Design a protein around this nucleic acid. Structure first.
Ligand SMILES: [Mg+2]
Length: 84
DNA sequence: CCGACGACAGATAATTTGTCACTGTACAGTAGAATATAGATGCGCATCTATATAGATGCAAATTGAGTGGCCTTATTAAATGACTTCTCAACCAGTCA
């Protein structure tokens, strides 16, 4: 039960080093140095313009690592794809 | 004189509200979907039915042609016309005369 509950501290102050699958760390020095992206389902069922059920949209977000500002999105019924 | 209860004032923690520091936990591709059933509706194919017969037959008038049966004055003469039958159809010698 303890081994599931373990907390981790966090980056503290203006210094941040993003670890890659290559074992290299990217030193994030300034705005637009490292953007990040992945997808998820939203948790609301939407309806068509007639009020009948469609499906839960997919949300994509692009974030800048240095500022943590949300730099762009895509929201739609469409599937994760290199197009999205 | 002694004991008990109410008025008024004074001090106080419980209650509520606010602020502040530390923290467990979700973000991690994901439940609309699969699998039965009844119940109604529609298209297709078969399985009868009821009507509609024209051809064949039987029969009964309606002539229709072809039969058959029943009823009737007669004898002489004469003429006319048309017919039939019968009969007949020799040849030279002997006695006058101009
Ligand atoms: Mg992802």
């Amino acid at each position: 039960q303890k081994a599931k509950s373990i907390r981790s501290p966090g980056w503290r102050g203006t210094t941040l080093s993003v670890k890659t699958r290559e074992g290299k760390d990217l030193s994030v020095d300034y705005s637009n140095h490292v953007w990040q992206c992945d997808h998820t389902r939203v948790d609301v069922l939407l309806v068509d313009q007639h009020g009948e059920i469609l499906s839960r949209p997919w949300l994509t977000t692009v974030i800048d690592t240095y500022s943590r500002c949300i730099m762009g999105i895509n929201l739609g019924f469409d599937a994760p794809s290199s197009g999205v």
